[PDB]
Amino acid sequence: SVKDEAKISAQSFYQRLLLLNEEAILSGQDFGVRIDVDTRRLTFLQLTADKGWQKWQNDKMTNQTTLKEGLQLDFELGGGAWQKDDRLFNPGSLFDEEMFQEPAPQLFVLSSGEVTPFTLSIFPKGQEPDEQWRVTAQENGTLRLLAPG
Amino acid sequence: SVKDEAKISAQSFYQRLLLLNEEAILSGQDFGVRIDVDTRRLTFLQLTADKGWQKWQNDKMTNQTTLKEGLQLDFELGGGAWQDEEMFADEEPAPQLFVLSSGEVTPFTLSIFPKGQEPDEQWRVTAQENGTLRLLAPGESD
Ligand SMILES: [Cl-]
Ligand code: NA
Ligand code: NA
């Protein structure tokens, strides 16, 4: 069911975030996660001096995931408000093609082991983001997967 | 004169960039420079997890340079071309130049020159693909 999907999607994010935190610490390089609430996408990025933020091409994990239809995602930075607006959809984000330089991650996963404080929640369409399957960090890199409630 | 000012500014940016790279390496933290061509500003930033890029508050160098009004700046990257009231009282743009803890610096050239001249072959600071940082006088070096 969609609730079962939400769990699996939260475990997938947790595993990927842990992996990137581990990669940063072992490699001395900085990584990041870009969350796109309107397209329900998470992209896993590496910072290089010569090309800035790029998708991380690697032999451990895919670098972009998109939620299955029927799931939503949302996120908070630090103590702040949920990021997603109330619209059912962003009229501009429906278009696969440009209508009118990899965008920077909101979550930094630094070589020091520090991670941007945040909460990402994943939940069935029709529900609010609060008290859902969620992954949270704090600044020191401590990271939690939390069940609804 | 304005040409003497260009030199002094180029020399100062080299010194500040060298310190930033040295600090990145020594400290394991990431830094960067943001260049604002229109306003003639160079801003020296630090990457933190919790606040992203922010001005580098430190006790050794200033973290924002604004060139004197008779001067102009431009930069190229690698082989590219020249570039409300609150209800209760108690209710940073990214750098183009990354100065990473690995010691690597975004390949670039910044040139500083009297207002309205061409940016080529001016007092300049370059970070080459090699890793090296160079201060170069006007004209092509030997
Ligand atoms: Cl400077
Ligand atoms: Na994304
Ligand atoms: Na990319």
Swiss-Prot record, chain A:
It is found in: Cell inner membrane. The keyword Transport applies. Keywords: Cell inner membrane, Cell membrane, Membrane, Methylation, Protein transport, Transmembrane, Transmembrane helix, Transport. Coiled coil: none annotated. Disulfide bonds: none annotated. Cleaved by prepilin peptidase. Methylated by prepilin peptidase at the amino group of the N-terminal phenylalanine once the leader sequence is cleaved by prepilin peptidase. The keyword Protein biosynthesis does not apply. It is a single-pass membrane protein. GO terms for cellular component: plasma membrane; type II protein secretion system complex. GO terms for biological process: protein secretion by the type II secretion system. Its main location: membrane. Component of the type II secretion system required for the energy-dependent secretion of extracellular factors such as proteases and toxins from the periplasm. Part of the pseudopilus tip complex that is critical for the recognition and binding of secretion substrates. Type II secretion is composed of four main components: the outer membrane complex, the inner membrane complex, the cytoplasmic secretion ATPase and the periplasm-spanning pseudopilus. Interacts with core component EpsG. This is Type II secretion system protein H.
Swiss-Prot record, chain B:
Its main location: membrane. Cleaved by prepilin peptidase. Methylated by prepilin peptidase at the amino group of the N-terminal phenylalanine once the leader sequence is cleaved by prepilin peptidase. One of its GO terms (cellular component) is type II protein secretion system complex. It is found in: Cell inner membrane. It comes from the Bacteria. It is a single-pass membrane protein. Keywords: Cell inner membrane, Cell membrane, Membrane, Methylation, Protein transport, Transmembrane, Transmembrane helix, Transport. GO terms for biological process: protein secretion by the type II secretion system. Belongs to the GSP H family. Type II secretion is composed of four main components: the outer membrane complex, the inner membrane complex, the cytoplasmic secretion ATPase and the periplasm-spanning pseudopilus. Interacts with core component EpsG. Component of the type II secretion system required for the energy-dependent secretion of extracellular factors such as proteases and toxins from the periplasm. Part of the pseudopilus tip complex that is critical for the recognition and binding of secretion substrates. This is Type II secretion system protein H.
